[PDB]
């Protein structure tokens, strides 16, 4: 929500604001998906008993 409305918009300038909004919200979803895909899983098979 912080990154998206920066892809908006105008001019020669905002082009550049697209070059980050996307490039980082991407990593958002990837990270958080991994976070329920890969992380919990590998935080189960690889943690040592306490």
């Amino acid at each position: 929500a912080v990154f998206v409305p920066m892809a908006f918009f105008g001019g020669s300038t905002g082009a550049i604001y697209r070059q980050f909004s996307i490039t980082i919200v991407s990593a958002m979803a990837l990270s958080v998906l991994v976070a329920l895909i890969l992380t919990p899983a590998l935080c189960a098979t690889m943690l040592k008993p306490i």
């Binding site: 912080v2 998206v4 409305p5 920066m6 001019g11 020669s12 300038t13 550049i16």
Partner: protein, 400 residues
């Protein structure tokens, strides 16, 4: 202190780099022979070659072009530098180098020499102030647009408080040579006006005739007097055209000559005769109110002169236009999703207050570095507030 750190802090668009290369501009008076320009190119090179061996790798210099245009009085240098690891220091980076160069060149009499860094990227030169254009909105001509643009050039370089370096970008009304064929003497002497004008044009200006072949490649065939007959205005008299009878007249008979004045880089913008204007705002002022001041100084000008902003002044750029509106609706989207996660309307405000605590140490970093608020910074700022959000969100979602 956040807000005040936020307005005391200046605002770049993107930092220039040391891109490994840079340039130099050479402009003489006019007409100014090619040879003179070459004299000054020899100078400039002699600098980057004697007084800079530790950093220079190659100066590629060209008598014949500019970043304004071709001319005999147009000159340009292409400088590449030795590798970055090989010039360690600030003393040896583009800034200081093109600085002392420009400072050193500063010297040369009747030769405008300035050396600069490539403004960041491609034809993104949409920074550095403005670009103003006068427009012949009636039938006025070149004279009245010259003078009107002078009224401007004048009345604005007498306001050095929010406006300076106000010069025309073009080239300058160098004198010209008028030839006048009194037609009657030409008919009376029996000479084809075609023949006259032909020979004048070919002699003094060359003529592409047809093409020939040069080792299995086609090339041109030009025709033009030896250079020993076109350097001097007296040499018009040495040229003969064959009259209808058979006798050969020299131009001396049917022509009359004299010196005059007129532009060598006539300008138009959007149909009409235009002249284009350059310069910056003034070291405490922005490009915006500078522009306004130009719009107002323009207003007091003769009937028939209009104005328009192109180039970097058409667009207008970034933060201060509507970019905090982006931060704003981004914030509205955020408090929305936080009223979704907390199902409160207050509770997200425990995570809204978390924001100033980040802009505070951002802004601090800025002014305390000599740095300045740009794209890089503002995405840093976004990232800041987002991360702090993460932190707070997690503590209070834990607490509730």
């Amino acid at each position: 202190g956040m807000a005040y750190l936020f307005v005391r802090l200046p605002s770049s668009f993107l930092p220039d780099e040391d891109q490994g290369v840079f340039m130099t501009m050479v402009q003489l008076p006019a007409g100014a022979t090619q040879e003179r320009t070459q004299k000054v190119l020899n100078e400039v090179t002699h600098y980057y070659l004697t007084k800079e061996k530790n950093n220079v790798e190659s100066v590629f210099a060209v008598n014949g072009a500019g970043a304004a245009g071709a001319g005999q009085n147009t000159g340009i240098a292409f400088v590449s530098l030795k590798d970055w690891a090989d010039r360690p220091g600030e003393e040896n980076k583009v800034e200081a180098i093109t600085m002392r160069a420009t400072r050193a060149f500063s010297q040369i009499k009747d030769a405008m020499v300035f050396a600069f860094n490539l403004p960041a990227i491609v034809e993104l030169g949409t920074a550095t102030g403005f670009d103003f254009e006068l427009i012949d909105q009636a039938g006025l001509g070149h004279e009245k647009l010259t003078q009107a643009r002078n009224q401007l050039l004048a009345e604005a370089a007498k306001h050095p408080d929010m406006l300076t370096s106000v010069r025309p970008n073009g080239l300058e009304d160098t004198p010209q040579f008028k030839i006048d064929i009194d037609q009657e003497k030409a008919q009376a002497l029996g000479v084809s006006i075609n023949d006259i004008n032909t020979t004048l044009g070919a002699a003094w200006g060359g003529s592409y005739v047809n093409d020939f072949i040069d080792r299995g490649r086609v090339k041109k065939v030009y025709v033009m007097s030896e250079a020993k007959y076109r350097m001097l205005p007296d040499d018009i008299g040495d040229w003969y055209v064959r009259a209808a009878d058979g006798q050969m007249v020299p131009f001396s008979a049917f022509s009359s000559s004299r010196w005059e004045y007129g532009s060598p880089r006539l300008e138009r913008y959007n149909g009409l005769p235009s002249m284009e204007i350059l310069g910056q705002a003034a070291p405490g002022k922005s490009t915006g109110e500078a522009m306004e001041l130009m719009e107002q100084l323009a207003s007091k000008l003769p009937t028939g002169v209009g104005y328009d902003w192109t180039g970097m002044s058409y667009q207008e750029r970034l933060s201060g236009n509507q970019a905090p509106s982006l931060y704003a609706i981004s914030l509205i989207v955020v408090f929305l999703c936080l009223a979704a996660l907390y199902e409160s309307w207050s509770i997200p405000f425990s995570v809204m207050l978390v924001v100033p605590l980040g802009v505070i140490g951002a802004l601090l970093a800025a002014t305390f570095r000599g740095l300045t608020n740009d794209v890089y910074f503002q995405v840093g700022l976004l990232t800041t507030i987002g991360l702090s959000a993460k932190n707070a969100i997690l503590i209070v979602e834990f607490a509730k």
